[PDB]
Design a protein around this ligand. Structure first.
Ligand SMILES: COc1cccc(-c2nn(C(C)(C)C)c(N)c2C(N)=O)c1
Ligand SMILES: COc1cccc(-c2nn(C(C)(C)C)c(N)c2C(N)=O)c1
Ligand SMILES: [Ca+2]
Lengths: 279, 283
């Protein structure tokens, strides 16, 4: 059994520590490693708690064990009595959430890139589900689908807010293999429409109520134009993905087998052209 | 310390297996993983040739970093042994520099990012505990990913091939030669020269042994207008980097950390957009 240890990073090695965002998991800051000469990202919560330490160490172990092409690569851990945090590669293009909803900044997000993003999300989650034992994300949202330098996906913040990606059966306490695909069906809808799921709804409870009654984000000509490539296929994927009955939702394998023919239609140059258009 | 175990990949999980090349350290094939649904590269071959595969696996697994080839798993069966890594669609730096018909242009910003990335990768190895030394840096084992970012592979020396990247004092190897923390920077310097000129080092000299004599004396690849034009961005500071890196005396050669610090302002002069334009031009 070949083993690899996660490097320990001394806090004094991280320079230019600039704030980026504060979330439930912690505060994300950009920095540069003094020795390695690369930009990094740091996640930290001053005294915290005795149990709060057990969380940060658990996320680091998860990222380190779930290493893959579509999972945020972890570079090291800051484990000092003075400062606690995880260090990962720096994602310069933010979250899928920002790309989809910052419409003045991004008026055109070409179809091939949207499909590649959807393909990559499914590849990362599929990889998790294929580990031994299977790792379940359970918190998939557009906010934690990160975008690297070339707009390739890196999945973060996982296994271990917003309930729009939570399946109806999760509302009541439960004693859960079909969660992730529900979240993925919503993300797919969001990616293809660039609309916020349930725009007309003020209170999150009204969403939760509607979802328990089998209602989903709206599928019509307004939300999903008829000119969307592979529209029919994508609609089937979405509708099966978010089906009320968990048993009627596909595995990520089935989902990938469905996506593969779609992705083969796009030339490699079209992904590059979609990216250059965003700059 | 937290431990990550390298996955064992059953050989039968690999489908659509196609031959890519035959190298000194083994045969390289492309494939798709049946469960993970990604393209992969597979490197394969008694009880002695077995430990070499396992060693490169362990090194790739321990040396994980943004500019090092990511290993995905290992095939360890009585029927088949080999390593599985991320598939590099754009081959080696060597093929980029010397396939002039296939690649008429290789824009300056891309060349500089390639150089910056090789340096970041090697630097990382040098900064591990204990320091990992490459000792076989050549253009043939600098791999290029889908968007022409660098992945360093082949830690087999961490029959042979090319001698042009080997420093003179390493010609007759010893205890001092194998522990030399200044081997790699010499290789990097020759690589830097080769990148900036798109010329085969010592082209005039067609006899490999003669190159070895010339290099002993103090001769290096030709630094003139013919090989390195005046139009080359930051020409002077690069020649300074090359010449100091391939200096006859190992004590006069800089660390990668110093080369990086020199390179940082050079890379900042290129707008982000140009890197993307360069890749589109090659595609
Ligand atoms: C350092 O660890 C993490 C963990 C999860 C997400 C991020 C991260 N968030 N963002 C925001 C988009 C939320 C600012 C980035 N740009 C991150 C990164 N790795 O670069 C960092
Ligand atoms: C499977 O392990 C390796 C190890 C070292 C190099 C390569 C590799 N060589 N090439 C050649 C350029 C030599 C064909 C590729 N395209 C590789 C890859 N990782 O895709 C593979
Ligand atoms: Ca061309």
């Amino acid at each position: 059994a070949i083993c690899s240890a996660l490097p320990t990073i001394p806090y004094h090695k991280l320079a230019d520590l600039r704030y980026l965002s504060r979330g439930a998991s912690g505060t994300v800051s950009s920095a540069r490693h003094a020795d390695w000469r690369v930009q990094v990202a740091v996640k930290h919560l001053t005294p915290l708690l005795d149990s709060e330490r057990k969380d940060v160490l658990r996320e680091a172990e998860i990222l380190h064990k779930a290493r893959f092409s579509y999972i945020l690569p972890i570079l090291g851990i800051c484990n000092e009595p003075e400062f606690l945090g995880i260090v990962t590669e720096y994602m310069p293009n933010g979250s899928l959430n920002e790309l989809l909803h910052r419409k003045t900044e991004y008026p055109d997000v070409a179809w091939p890139l949207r499909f590649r993003i959807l393909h990559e999300i499914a590849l990362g989650v599929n990889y998790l589900h294929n580990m031994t034992p299977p790792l379940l994300h359970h918190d998939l949202k557009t906010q934690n689908i990160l975008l690297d330098n070339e707009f390739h996906v890196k999945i973060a913040d996982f296994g271990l807010g917003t309930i729009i990606y939570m399946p109806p059966e999760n509302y009541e306490p439960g004693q859960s293999i079909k969660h992730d695909i529900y979240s993925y069906a919503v993300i797919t809808w969001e990616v293809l429409s660039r609309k916020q799921p349930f725009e007309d709804v003020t209170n999150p409870l009204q969403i939760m109520y509607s979802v328990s009654q089998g209602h989903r984000p709206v599928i019509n000509e307004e939300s999903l134009p008829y000119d969307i490539p592979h529209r029919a296929r994508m609609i089937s994927l979405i509708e099966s993905g978010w089906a009320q009955n968990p048993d009627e939702r596909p595995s990520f394998l089935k989902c990938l087998i469905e996506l593969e023919p779609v992705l083969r239609t796009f030339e490699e140059i079209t992904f590059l052209e979609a990216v250059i258009q965003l700059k």
